[PDB]
Design a protein around this motif. Structure first.
Motif, mmCIF file in Angstrom:
data_model
loop_
_atom_site.group_PDB
_atom_site.id
_atom_site.type_symbol
_atom_site.label_atom_id
_atom_site.label_comp_id
_atom_site.label_asym_id
_atom_site.label_seq_id
_atom_site.Cartn_x
_atom_site.Cartn_y
_atom_site.Cartn_z
ATOM 1 N N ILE A 123 35.423 48.703 38.304
ATOM 2 C CA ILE A 123 36.535 48.271 39.138
ATOM 3 C C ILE A 123 36.303 48.722 40.577
ATOM 4 O O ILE A 123 36.665 49.833 40.966
ATOM 5 N N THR A 128 33.666 40.662 40.275
ATOM 6 C CA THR A 128 34.509 39.726 39.540
ATOM 7 C C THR A 128 34.342 39.997 38.054
ATOM 8 O O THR A 128 33.267 40.395 37.599
ATOM 9 N N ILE A 134 40.267 43.810 33.417
ATOM 10 C CA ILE A 134 40.859 44.389 34.614
ATOM 11 C C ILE A 134 42.116 45.176 34.248
ATOM 12 O O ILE A 134 42.967 44.691 33.504
ATOM 13 N N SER A 138 46.359 46.545 38.888
ATOM 14 C CA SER A 138 45.408 46.555 39.994
ATOM 15 C C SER A 138 45.630 45.347 40.899
ATOM 16 O O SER A 138 46.307 44.389 40.520
ATOM 17 N N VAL A 140 44.086 42.165 42.839
ATOM 18 C CA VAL A 140 42.953 41.245 42.834
ATOM 19 C C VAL A 140 43.193 40.019 43.713
ATOM 20 O O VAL A 140 44.243 39.887 44.341
ATOM 21 N N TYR A 160 46.667 38.765 48.455
ATOM 22 C CA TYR A 160 46.286 39.267 47.139
ATOM 23 C C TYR A 160 47.335 39.047 46.056
ATOM 24 O O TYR A 160 48.524 38.893 46.337
ATOM 25 N N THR A 190 38.785 38.342 41.221
ATOM 26 C CA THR A 190 37.984 39.235 42.047
ATOM 27 C C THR A 190 38.836 40.379 42.579
ATOM 28 O O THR A 190 39.911 40.162 43.135
ATOM 29 N N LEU A 191 38.340 41.598 42.402
ATOM 30 C CA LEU A 191 39.050 42.795 42.838
ATOM 31 C C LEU A 191 39.131 42.930 44.355
ATOM 32 O O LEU A 191 38.246 42.473 45.081
#
Length: 271
Positions: A123, A128, A134, A138, A140, A160, A190-191
């Motif tokens: 992470i 991705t 995940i 969080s 992303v 986001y 995607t983080l």
RNA sequence: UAGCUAGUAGGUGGGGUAACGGCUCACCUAGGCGACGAUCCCUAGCUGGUCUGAGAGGAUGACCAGCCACACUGGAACUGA
RNA sequence: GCUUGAGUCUCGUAGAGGGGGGUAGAAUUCCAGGUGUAGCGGUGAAAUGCGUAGAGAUCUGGAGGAAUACCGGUGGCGAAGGCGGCCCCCUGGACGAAGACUGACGCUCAGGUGCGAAAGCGUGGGGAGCAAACAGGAUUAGAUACCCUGGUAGUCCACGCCGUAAACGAUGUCGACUUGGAGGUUGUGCCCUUGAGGCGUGGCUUCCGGAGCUAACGCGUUAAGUCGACCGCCUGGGGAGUACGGCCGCAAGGUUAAAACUCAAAUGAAUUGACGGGGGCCCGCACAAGCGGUGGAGCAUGUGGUUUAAUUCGAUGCAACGCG
RNA sequence: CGCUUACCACUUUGUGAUUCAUGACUGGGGUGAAGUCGUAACAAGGUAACCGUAGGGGAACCUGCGGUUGGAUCACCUCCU
RNA sequence: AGGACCGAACCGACUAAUGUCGAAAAAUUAGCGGAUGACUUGUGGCUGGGGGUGAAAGGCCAAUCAAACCGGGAGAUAGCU
RNA sequence: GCUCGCCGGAAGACCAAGGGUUCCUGUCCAACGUUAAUCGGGGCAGGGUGAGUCGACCCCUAAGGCGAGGCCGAAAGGCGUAGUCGAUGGGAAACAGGUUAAUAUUCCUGUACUUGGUGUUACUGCGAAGGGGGGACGGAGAAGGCUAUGUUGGCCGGGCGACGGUUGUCCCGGUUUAAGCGUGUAGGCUGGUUUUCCAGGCAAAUCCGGAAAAUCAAGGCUGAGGCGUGAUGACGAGGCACUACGGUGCUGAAGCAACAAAUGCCCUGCUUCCAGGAAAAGCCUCUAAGCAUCAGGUAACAUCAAAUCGUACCCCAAACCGACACAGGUGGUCAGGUAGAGAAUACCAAGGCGCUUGAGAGAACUCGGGUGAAGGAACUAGGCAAAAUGGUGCCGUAACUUCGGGAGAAGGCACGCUGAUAUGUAGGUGAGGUCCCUCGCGGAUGGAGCUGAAAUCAGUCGAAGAUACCAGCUGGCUGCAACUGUUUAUUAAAAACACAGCACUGUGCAAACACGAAAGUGGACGUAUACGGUGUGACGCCUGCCCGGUGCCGGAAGGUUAAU
RNA sequence: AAUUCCUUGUCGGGUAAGUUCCGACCUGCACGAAUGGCGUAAUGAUGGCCAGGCUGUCUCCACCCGAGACUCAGUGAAAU
RNA sequence: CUUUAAUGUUUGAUGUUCUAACGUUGACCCGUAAUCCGGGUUGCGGACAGUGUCUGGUGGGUAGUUUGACUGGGGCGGUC
RNA sequence: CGCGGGGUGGAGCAGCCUGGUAGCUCGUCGGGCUCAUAACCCGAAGGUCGUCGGUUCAAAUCCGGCCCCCGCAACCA
RNA sequence: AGGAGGUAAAAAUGUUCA
């Protein structure tokens, strides 16, 4: 940074330029550029369907990899380029096997950082991996909707999605509008938030600033004759009508969401 | 009232005044004055003294007298020690 | 030149001094799921609001932001403002011990420079709780207040700006000298630590008080006591900390700082009373505990008002009204 | 002597600075017969006051934030040897 | 650096006179505005009649526009001349 | 034919577009030309357009069009994949001179150059609708190096001149030369080379990309121009020579140097900012399916081929567009001298014209202008119009402000010419000589010549020195709109529209919305820091009271309530 | 007031004289806070007012230079 | 009759689940070098969504039209 | 037009589903609480329960039928 | 001795001189 120009001329007075010196000042990567002819807001019939669009500077479409399906291959970001098709920045990332691609630039990304795709990735901003790997809660971006479609949500600068909760195959997502929509858990995400978060604070200053931006002049309703607009008419700024669109559709308070097939995913509507 | 002055700060040569002197020119130097108050503005003839007060001071400068300044207003000059 | 002034070096002491970077726990709010049901929430009472669409209550899990429970202490550090969960890193000052060293390098300071609670402002983030303005519900003679339900800016963060406070022990800074007792906090030395220790020598600070000072109140070895050095500031009250100008500021304003006019008081301390939705103790058919009544009814009577040629005058909260 | 060169006062022109009166009207202030609405400070002043500041309001003031005391009262009911 | 300044070409068309059976079915003359930009321009495409396009005047769409032109309903209808 | 006058960043010289024989010669005059006309863009006849290098065609794409099947739609038809057309775009190759009444980078002389075919010889692996590189690209600005071109001098030829001078520091004319080849420069770009290996390039790959070592430091690429060659050639002033008197024939010297210098070129550069700047093929290169005693490919050489169409003339206009031989409009290229900042303007060169009715007169009146006694807006709806101001350098410059401006605020001084400082300075360019060198188009040194501001002083001329053309009127108070900009083409340019900015509100993507019977497109190959609609309209201080009516949003219990 | 009808409202300034103009008073027929209110440097071929300069705009025209008008020769319309 | 309790039953609904209709402007393969399209595996939705017929409501977006006469001109008032 | 619903002091409005009670407030008279005013606390006029016929021991209520307000949908002389 | 949990809703003005 935030550059506030000096008023050495009227029309330059209010302009606020946004510089990002980390950008690549040179030329773009040729193998990923294709022609992007402008439309002018005109469909196949030729009629202008969407108004206030056309003209402006010529640009070229840079193929951005939204899919991100390079599983098990590390990648190092070379540089940050300027993509005129977006509101954010794109990074020319090189893979270990030599393949070059363009990905949306996350917030904390520098020229020379390491990223990778797949359910193996740690992470860290840029990596991705499906949302069933995940951690719940969080932040992303570039979230897919159909497991393999490409990535739809959170694509603008400094935008986001926050993975709220998970119920088996479903994942609750608090969107940017403040609307919670459920999505399939096997969707790629995607983080990290999208970079260039200062795109908002940019002001144009000049009237022609919007003209090369692509926008054309927008005329109000009460400045036309009745045959052209429902507001129109008058012998001097008379209105007396309920705010509508150029086609009689009520505006300024009128929900026109007619879907019914996607209501099953909506938990909370925009508030 | 915080910067002020540009023959203005000084020297050199000539000149000039009864006499020293930027008093006045020519040339060179770029300083001179200034918070222990310059320049700017307002005000007023200075004092010996006088009225007062225990002294210290405060106020004041009419009358007498000493010094400066003016002569309707402003500029220049003569005669003559 | 010396050394009692002042400063430096070696070893240590205690700590919310300051700056930056990570982190933990409880609580609160929001969300997803399971459980489950007519209230929940709130108040002086009550209502808006929340809720039969199933909240609140409860359990598991997650996300966030802010402040750091107990330890916490008129305890500590700092010039002041002010500063505390835990840890790391950089860094400041003070203090104590044993000596040495430079040899008055000192103190103050108009101008000037910097920091400087909170509130506020600008740029961009963050936004749980709280909360101006504001909407609604009560209350009220009115409530654009106190109260309750929500809630924007703000509160927080980064870089600049503001530069004001009852910024206050309302007490400038420095040094000398001048009876003590009771505690807290922190070094060091000596003696048998021969047992929660004993006697001294220093830094900081609280309380009570002597001399002395003060108008008094009270200050009192950290002084308002006795002296010396430098700086700031005041000259009756209002006008006014305002006007005009300058300067600083994005703005809101801040700073420096009058006159006319107008008044003869303004102000402090302390003393005797009175008042108080201050308090303590005590007392009376004051209340409480009961009985008998007034007020509603007729009548007798007094009085106000009304009427009247005059319906005499006086009394007219309790303390006038079967009173003269 | 005349002419002329230089200096030159009166005076004219353009543009600044400062200061003295006047000026329709206007903000605030002071004074003054026992007006009007609300009751704001004075006790714990019935929401403690006040200082700074921001916002609001017919008016005193109200409201948040932080700070000071130039604020008061800490007697009675349930547990413990 | 600039929708920056002055000013030709270029684009535009504010004022006046001329012209008005004109040189011209909106021009000439002397002056005017923009003139590195929302600029101007050549060549080739695309949008169409209750539709197009319009920095919006009900302006423009072949000297014609509150709904183009050509032909067809159609010798429309006309209590009017 | 001789004077005269006008344009000369055009009224000149050439292309594209568009016209369509208007081009040239002879001949003719009725009609045509606003007059006459032996003249002509008029009538009649005849002549004229020559290409492997120019353009088009051709190869390849853009916007966009059509569109096998396909999807969709009463029919017509619409949309669109593969494909296939479509330039104003990309891609091979020539210049000088001569010549005709009229054509020429086309014909003739000289000197080259490009792409293919065939064949021969010597070698070698070649080979797709596939992969990679390249092609291949933005605005603005500054600097350096050159050229086109120009000026002066030297040189060569000629003259020394109808009114004073002119063998002299004199005057007029000329001093022209390409493409190609060789060199590879000023300058610019990038570190080369070798080996091993790989989940990358719809398969493969030695080509590209990537990861590790080694060796050495340069190599490679691009590139205006100059200098040689091209060229003891051509051209060339002027003579020599006959004239149908138009010109032809013949001959023929110098042909260098210096400085100045572009908007042309190097530059499709370099720096910087941002609004982030076509596609494909030709070319180069690596291979797949396969094909090898082959075929093909590289190189050398010989020979053959390079077709078809346009080509005349007009092209800022009597030939196009405007009914005309029309004061209008029409893209691109070249663009000299003196003064000047300049492509302004003034006067000229090259070159071309005097605009197709003239001759007299000199009235009122009209149009286009010059000047004015005294006054100076008394004119008038109004300073409309005219007048006036007008340049460079320096001095100096307020209220107010967003601290940039305001501002060229306002208002003043000096400007010509000559000489001296200085037989033209500062500056610029720069040969020879000299030295060194990894040796060339080199680097330092060196300084003749050439060119040439501006400043100061003195003197002098006129009434006036920015003397002409050219070339701001200024200041104060104020309404509206912020400002640039846009609009009623042909009576309105504004206070109208737009505008950056702000707010509300809609939209979770097969998005809202729009065109369209539908499919499908636009929105967007974008996705809430995004997009649509609506209102207001920089910036500053702000933005109050009202939810009854109407629209909208939300909650449905109840009443009424369609089809069924 | 781009809004005020009554009206040329009233006061002050400007001029010898000002229905316009500029600063105020509120009696706002019938301003008003994004159909935005109020300010505002700069900008404007913008609307209104004033002063300096400047001039034939005018007092009051005069003269002159050119193109027409007039005459001659050729050509030869039009509205009605 | 009012009010309620259990069952069966009659319908309208609602909830959840399922896969085969249907959807798919998800991925993968082939037709084929082709992002149209068709078909085949698969995933996710799922009896919804969407479309046809009837029908209530909305609707100046659009269309066809009406909008009286007399009148000491017309308009207003008044009248028939 | 036919399903609903609603009428009661001088205006505002519960008792209406449950038949037995015409009430709750502000306005106009006074009276209490104060030192007085104010505020507040209370009692007090007065409604054919729209009218009318009628089941009941008794009527606003449940019942009937008709004048009269307001709510959508119905109407082609 | 040494320290803790809990405890008061509402009530305004004063026409002025002496």
């Amino acid at each position: 940074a935030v550059v506030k120009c000096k008023p050495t001329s009227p029309g330059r007075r209010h302009v606020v330029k946004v510089v990002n010196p980390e950008l690549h000042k040179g030329k773009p990567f040729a193998p990923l550029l294709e022609k992007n002819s402008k439309s002018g807001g005109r469909n196949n019939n030729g009629r202008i369907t969407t108004r206030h669009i056309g003209g402006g500077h010529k640009q070229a479409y840079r193929i951005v990899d939204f899919k991100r399906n390079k599983d098990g291959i590390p990648a190092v970001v070379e540089r940050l380029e300027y993509d005129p098709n977006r509101s954010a920045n794109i990074a020319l990332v090189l893979y270990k096997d030599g393949e070059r691609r363009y990905i949306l630039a996350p917030k904390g990304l520098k020229a020379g950082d390491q990223i990778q795709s797949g359910v193996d990735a740690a992470i860290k901003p840029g990596n991705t991996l499906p949302m069933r790997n995940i951690p719940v809660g969080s932040t992303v971006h570039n979230v897919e909707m159909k497991p393999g479609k490409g990535g739809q949500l959170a694509r603008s600068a400094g935008t986001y999605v926050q993975i709220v909760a998970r119920d088996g195959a479903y994942v609750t997502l608090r969107l940017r509008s403040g609307e919670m929509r459920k999505v399939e858990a096997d969707c790629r995400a995607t983080l990290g938030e999208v970079g260039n978060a200062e795109h908002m604070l940019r002001v144009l200053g000049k009237a022609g600033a919007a003209r090369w931006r692509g926008v054309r002049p927008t005329v109000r309703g009460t400045a036309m004759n009745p045959v052209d607009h429902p507001h129109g008419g008058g012998e001097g700024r008379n209105f007396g009508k309920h705010p509508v669109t150029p086609w009689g559709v009520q505006t300024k308070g009128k929900k026109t969401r007619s879907n019914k097939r996607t209501d099953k995913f909506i938990v909370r509507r925009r508030s």
